[model samples]
Target: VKGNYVQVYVMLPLDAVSVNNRFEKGDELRAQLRKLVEAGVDGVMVDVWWGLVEGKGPKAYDWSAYKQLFELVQKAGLKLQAIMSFHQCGGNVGDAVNIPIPQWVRDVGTRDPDIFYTDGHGTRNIEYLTLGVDNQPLFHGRSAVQMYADYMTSFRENMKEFLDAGVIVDIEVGLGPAGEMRYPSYPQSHGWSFPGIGEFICYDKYLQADFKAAAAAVGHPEWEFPNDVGQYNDTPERTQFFRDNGTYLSEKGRFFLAWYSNNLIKHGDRILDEANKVFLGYKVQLAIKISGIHWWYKVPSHAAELTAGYYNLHDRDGYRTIARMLKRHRASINFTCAEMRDSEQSSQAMSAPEELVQQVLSAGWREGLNVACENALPRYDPTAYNTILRNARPHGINQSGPPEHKLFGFTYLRLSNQLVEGQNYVNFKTFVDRMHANLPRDPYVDPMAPLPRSGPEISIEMILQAAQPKLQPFPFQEHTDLPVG
Candidate 1:
C-alpha cells in the first residue's frame, strides 16, 4: 500500500491456541517485533483471543498482556492487527480449547443447537466427549455467529483511538475444524458442528423447493420424486435432475459464503462506523471459489497442509467466490489474496515483500484480485489492496469470473519444490502449515499439473494449441517423477 510495499506480516505469539511462551517474556517479544519492523513490515497480526484473555468472564476483560504487546509494537514503530478467532487447539503442544466461542453464547442445543465446537469429520465435540462420530456443540446456535460478529464490533470499538491513529484491528474468518475437510469427500456420518444440522435443513429445504419449481415448470405428471435423502445423489434417470440440483445448491452455498464473509466485512465497516478508522482488510475461504461440491472436495483444508486445486485455470473458483462475496457483502472491505508459492529459499523467504508481491502477481493478483506473499506472516498479513490501483489483468477464464482472472498460485512447482517423491504431502503439508503461520491465507493447494483448459464443449487437450503462446517452451522443463502430493 505504501508504494509497492504491500503490508507484510507474521503470526503473533498470542495468535496461537496455546499460551505462547513468548508472551511470558514481554521484553523479549518486543525485541523480536522490533527486528520484524526493521526487516520491512508496516504491521503485524496478533490474536486477541477473548476466551484466552478472560478464561472465565462475566466481566473479565484482561488487557494487561495485550496492552504490553501494543506498547511493544509502538516502541518498535510497527502497527498491530488482530484476529478475533481461535486458530488451532494448540499448535502441536496442546489442544486448543473453544477459546474463540464468545461467552454470551450460553446455549449449545435445543433453542441454540447450531452453535457448537466441531471437528474435521463434522462431529460435535465437547471438552470431554470428543467421539469420532458425534456432532460437535455450538455456542448457542446462531448466537455464536452473532457473538463472533459482536466481539469483532466491540474489539474495533474498544480500539477506536488506536485505529484513528492508523493502527488496525480486523475480523478474519474463523478457523473451524472444518478447515481440514473437503466438500462431498466426507460422508454424512463424518459431519461436524451444530451448523451441520442447519446445513442439512437448508439442503433439504432447497431440494423441496427445487422439485416444486421443476414440477410446476415442466408440467409433467410423470416427473415425480422421492423423499429419501439418497434421492439427492447421482443416478442415471435422475441425471438432469441431479445436475440442476447440484448447480442450485452450489449457488446457494456460495451465497452462504458471501453472507459469512459479509459478517467479517461488517467488522471492517465498524472501524469506519465507530472510529472513522480504516486500515487493513478481511478474507474468505478459498473453498467457496470452486465449481461444484466435488471441486470443493479438491481444496486442501487449513487444518492440514496447503494444496492447489485442479491445475486448470478455470477450476480456481476460490478467487471468484471470494471476489463476489466481498463485492456483494463488504463492497467497502478491500484486500488481496496471497498466492503462496513453495518457498524453499529465504530470499524467496516470507520476509521478501517484493518476492511476495511477485508471488501474488504470478498467481494473478495483478488481474484485479489482491495479492500477498505466503509464509511471511502468521495468522494474517493485515494489508488492504486498492484493486483500482493494482488493476490486475485476467490470466484465463478457466475460473468463475471474467474469462481472464487466475485461480491462485502454483504450489506444485514453485512453492512445494521441497517435497520429495513417493511420499504423501506430509513434508509438503508441513511447509504449508508453517507457511500459513507466517501467512494466514492457505488457498486451494493441490497436486495436479496444470493442463490447459479446452472449454466445456471442448477439452483441456483441445485448447493446447491456443495456449501455445503461454505454454512452457519445454513440457518437462519443470516436470518430475514425483507423484502428485
Candidate 2:
C-alpha cells in the first residue's frame, strides 16, 4: 500500500455485465476506465453477479465476458476490487438490469419455494435463497453454502492471472439481499416504502424450524415468531412488537431476536470463511457489507435493524459484535449510507444516518477491522462529497504521521455516462483527489477549493461520545403519529 491507505474506486455502471452473460457497452466502458485512470483513481469495483456467470446451470461456469471486462480495467493501469454478488433474480426490476440467478436454482425453487425467503404472510421473496437452507442439499445435492463454495472456487481458478499479479486487491463477499450481510427487508416488491419498519422474513420452513429448535432448547416450546409486528409500511409506534415498551423487551422477544441475529452472524461467518479459504493465499483482502438500516436507529429497540438482523440499539453496542465477527476472518466492513446527512433526512421517523455512520465506523476501528464506505443514494453536490470525506477521514485533517483509524477506502456509488462527462466528473475527480490527498504519505489536497460545510460540527465531547458527536441535543422525536414519507 505504501501509505496509500485510502484509495478511491469508482463502481462500474450496473449494466456493464449484461443479462445474457456478455460484457455490454465494451467501447463506452473501455473509455470510462481510461477516464478513471486519467482522474488518478486507484481502481474500479465490479459487481461480479452470480446470475451472469453461473446463469446456465449448476457447476457450469463462464467468465468470458468478465475476463474481457477485467482485461480492460488492467490495461487501463488501474487496480481492481471485485464483489461476488450472490443475490438477485426472477426477472426483478429492483435492479437496473434483469440478471436472474442460475436457471437450475430457479428450477429447484419452483419445486420447493422454501429455498427462498418467506414473509410473515407466506409471501416468498425470490431475491436470494434463504439462509435456512445453507446446509441443505436441495439444489441437485449441493447445499446453498456448498454451491457458494463452488462459485468461489470457480472464480479463484478462472481469475488467477488477475489475482496473482495483485490487479485484484479486494474481494467483497455478498452475504444476502443486495449483497449486504443482512436479512432481506423493505423491498418495493413487498410493498415496503421509505421510513417504514419492514417485515421479518423468517416464515420460511427452514428458518422457522431453526427458530423452533432454539425456542425449545431455551425452555419455551410455545415460543414462536412474533406475529404482532406490523406490516412492511408500518411505524414502530403502530406495532406492539416494536413499540417503545412492547414484546421486543419481553423474555421471549429477546430470545427470538437473539436467535435471529445470531443466525445472520453465523451466515456471515459461514460465507466469509468459505471465501477466505477459497482465496486463502491470494494477496487480495476479504470483505463483507452490512446494510445501513437508519430509519429506526434512534428508537429504543432500533426496530428496523432488529428485523434485518442487527441488534444495534441505544443502550447496547450492536455493531461491535459484528465488528468482532469480521475480526476473526480479517474481513473489512463495507458500510452503506455515507452520503446521507441527518439534516436531509426525514425527522418524523427518527432516522439517524450520521450517528449510524459514527457508531459503525468507530466499531470497525475498535475491533481493528478495515472499514470502507459507500453512498446509499446517488449524490453529486459539494456538500455530499464533503460529508462523505468527513466520515471517511473520521480523524479530521490527519495529514500527519500514523493517523489513528481512518477509512481503508471509499467507493463512489457508480460510473455513468453522466457522471464521467460533465461538472459531475469534475466534482468526482476533486473528491477522489481529496480522498487520497487527506492522509499523510501522499498529500494531494487542492489548495484553491475550500470544503463545503456539512451540517453540524463534531464537538470534542461529541467526538468522545460518538466518534462524531452532536453538540446540539437532538429534539426528542415522539411517536405521536406515523411519519409521512
Candidate 3:
C-alpha cells in the first residue's frame, strides 16, 4: 500500500541482545532507533534471526532479545520490516557476528551432512539447509518446510500486538543464503573464490537424486550432472560449461539449467505458500529477495547467475520467470545493487549491474509486482545514493505514465558509525528527502541522470516550527556482497 518507503537496517550488536535469552537493550541502540525516527525514515528492518530465536532445539524458542528490541522500536515511534532470517549470521558481508542455526538442526546434519547444500567437491554449506529436504521429514520428524512454517507461526503469535497495531509492516522471508532466492553457488564465507565462474551447487545426494529423476523423466536417462564445468576459481574461458561453446548453449545444458532453476523456483513457491498461510489475513506484506548477480552478465551463458539458479541467458529473461511465480503468491520482489555503476565495474568480467537492475525491476513491474530496491555494497557516497534514487524512481517522479511503477521501498544497508557521521548523515538526510519527494520534476531535465550532489533546499524558518505537530515522525539494511564487480 505504501510507495518509496525509506527503511534503515539497524545493526544489532551481539552483546546488545543476543540469543539464549541474553538480553540488555542498551541505550546506544535505543538512541539509534530514535535517530532514524528524526531522520524521517519510514521504518527499520531487523533480522529476527532463526539462529537466535530457535537456536536451542526443536519447538524451543526464546525471543526475549527480539521482544526487547521490538519494544524499543515501538517507543521510538518507528515502523518495522522484520526479516525471518532462517540462514546463519556469519560468512556474508557485514557479518560481524557468528550465530549458527539451531544446535539440534546441526546435530541432524552431523548424522547426514547432505541435509545441507554441497558443492561437487563434497563441501557442505551450513548457511542454510538444502531445499531437497523441503518435504522430507528429516528434522526430528519435522520437514524443513514444516520447520519454517512453525517458526513463522510462532513469530506471528508472539508478536500479535505489533502485527495488529500495524507496527510490523513487512515480513521478509529468508529464501536462501544471503536471504535471496538463489543457491550457495559462489559461497564466499569459506574464502572459496572471487569474481570467477562459480560452480553449480547440485551435487548433494538429495539434489543429485532429484536431478537423476528429472533426467529420466525427460527421456535423457543417460545424462548425469554437469561434470565438465570448472571449479570455483576458474574463469569462464577455462570452463567448458560456461565458455562460448559451453554446455549451457547445447540442448543438454538447457535441460540442466532448466531443472536447476526450477528447483530454486519451487523452493520459493514452497516456502512462500506457507508464509502466505501463516500471515494469511494480516495487514502486512510478505516479501522475498532476488540477488543481483551482475558479473559475467554480458557473456552468453551468464555463468555466475546460472550457478545461483537463475537460468538467465542473453536470449532468455530468467527474472520474468521468477516474477511470474511471485505474482501467484502476491509477494513483492526485493532486488539489490541499485547503487552500482556499470563504468565502475570490471570490463573483463563483463559485469552489468546497471542492466541487471533494470532487467529485474522491469521484470517485476511487467509481472505486476511490488519492487523493493537495496544497495548491495556498503556505500555512503552521494553518487551511490543518487544511483539508488534514480532506480527507485526509474519512470520519473513526475511521470505521465503509470503511477504504480514507483518503488515499494528502498532499504539502506545500515545504521553504522560511518552512516551517521557528520557529512554522511547530511547526505543521507538529503537522500531520504528526495526519496520521499512528491514534488514536480523539471520538465526539460534528463530524469535518469545522477541527481545533483547538493540537495534541493528548504526554508529554515519553516523547518523550525517547534511543538508543531508540524513536527512529524519516521524510521529505516541487509547485506549480500555478490561479486563486487
Candidate 4:
C-alpha cells in the first residue's frame, strides 16, 4: 500500500471446512480465496501437506483438488507459494507426510532391519514433550531418506504441468518430523538411534548389509554385534577406533538428519531435474536448503533466564537441535516460532494475534518463501519484492521487531465477506486490487517476472455442491464487509 493501507493474507487450515474439497468445485475455493484476495489481502497461503495428497503411496497423490485450487488462485491473479509439510501436523497419528514417494520406497525402510525409528523401547525419549520429532540423535536409521526421494519423484509428476503453465512459483521440499527428542511419553513407538542393540536388530534390509559392509571397512567384520552398549565418549581411544571403522553404519544411524540434509539434496536434485523438463528456468531447494531460521518464542515471563532458550526447553532438546542440524547441513530457515495454540492471547496492537496464522507464515519464511500459497501468503509481490531487493534495509528480528506480520480469525472472516459477499468474480478482482495496495513489502527478486494470471477453467465442482448455496445471496451492491441476503 502506498500509505495508511496495509493489506494482508493469512494461513488458513482447510479443516475449517467440514467436507473434503474436490477439484471440479475448486472454483468455490476461489470465491473464498478471492474474498481474501479482494479484502485488501495480498494473497492467501495454503499448506500442501504431502501426506494428505499421497499418504498411501507414489502415484497415490491426488492432485485434482490441489491443481484446481492452484489454477483458480493463479487465474484470479493472486500470488501463491506452496509449503510442502512432510506427513502429519504436529502429532502421533500419522507415520509421516510421504508426498511423491512411490509405494516402492517404503520397501527400503521396511526391508532394512537396522533402519527403523524404534526398538524394544528404552532409548532417550521426548514424545510430545516438544515440537517437531522428539527422540535421541539417532540420525541414521530414523532418517527415512529413500522415502523422501520417492515422494519428490511423485511431487514432480503432480505439479510439473501446472508449474510449466505458470500457476505456481517456488517449490519447498525436505520438510518432515525428526525422531530426536530425549525424553519419554505414551507415544512410546518413537524412533531411536540405530547404533544400539535392541533398536538395530531387525526392521530394514539396508541395515543387514550396510552394518556388515561398514564393519568390514574398519576390519571389524568378525566383531559380533555388541549386545551391550554405553555412550561412546569423544576420547581418542574410543573416538579414534570408531572413526576408521564407523563406515556407513555411523552415517545410517542418524538417518533423520541425513534424510533432510543429505538425501534432501539428492531428492531435490532429481525433482528439479524432472521439473525442469516440464517447466524450464525453475530453481529448486530442499526444505532445509536455506538458512537464517527464526520462530515464535512465547517465552512465558516465568522462565525469563533462558528467553533465548535452545530448542523448546533448556534442560531438554526440541526444534533447536533440528535448527542446528539444519544449519550443519547448510540447509536454511532455522527460525521457528511457537504458538501455545489455544493459550497466549494477544492484543491487535501486539502484532500477529492469530496463532495458526503466525505459525504458517513463520514456517514458510524459514525457507525461500513465495507469496502465493494455500495457507500462507507470498513473502512479496514479484514486482514489489524486487523493488525492496534493489533498495531495502534488512529488518532486524527481535522482541520489538520481527520478520512476519500477525494473523487472526478476522482475516478469514474478512476474506469470507469479500468472497461470499461479492457474488461475482469481477467485483472480487476489484477488492483484490484494493487489498494488494496495502501489502507491507514484496519479496520477489525478479523485476522482469510477470504478475500472476488467472482463468475461468478452474472449478471447485464438489466443493460448490457441498457449500450451502448462499442461503440468500449477499446483495453485492453495498460496499460493506458483511454477508447479506
Which stretch of 10 consecutive residues in model 2 shows the poorest summed lDDT? 476-485
Question: Against the true structure, what is each candidate's TM-score?
Answer: 0.45, 0.89, 0.87, 0.42
Clashing pairs in 2: 437-444, 462-469
Q: Which residue runs does candidate 2 get wrong by more than 4 Å?
A: 1-5, 89-95, 438-485
> What TM-score number comes out for model 2?
0.89
lDDT comparison, 1 vs 3, better candidate: 3
Q: Write the per-residue lDDT of candidate 2 for residues 1-485, one digit (tens) a residue.
A: 23434678788876677778888788998888878877778888988989888888787799999999998888887778898988874355545577767777989987899999899888988878999999999989899999999998999899999987667888889899888888887888877888888888899999988988888887888887887898988999999989989999988887777788778877887777778778876777788898999998878978889888887666656677777766667788999898788889988878999888887887877767788999999998877877776776555444345455567888888888888888888888777766665333232321112112222322222222431221232222222111111
User: What does the lDDT read for residue 214 in candidate 2?
Assistant: 81
Evaluate all candidate structures by whole-model CA lDDT and list the values in order. Answer: 0.31, 0.78, 0.75, 0.33
User: In the order shown, what is each candidate's alpha-carbon RMSD?
Assistant: 14.4, 8.7, 12.3, 16.5
Single out the weakest 10-residue window by summed lDDT for candidate 1.
Answer: 301-310
Q: Which stretches of candidate 4 lie over 4 Å from their true place?
A: 1-9, 12-28, 52-62, 89-116, 119-147, 178-280, 283-334, 338-485
Best by TM-score: 2
- Ten contiguous residues minimizing lDDT sum, candidate 3: 474-483
For model 1 the local lDDT of residue 321 reads: 28
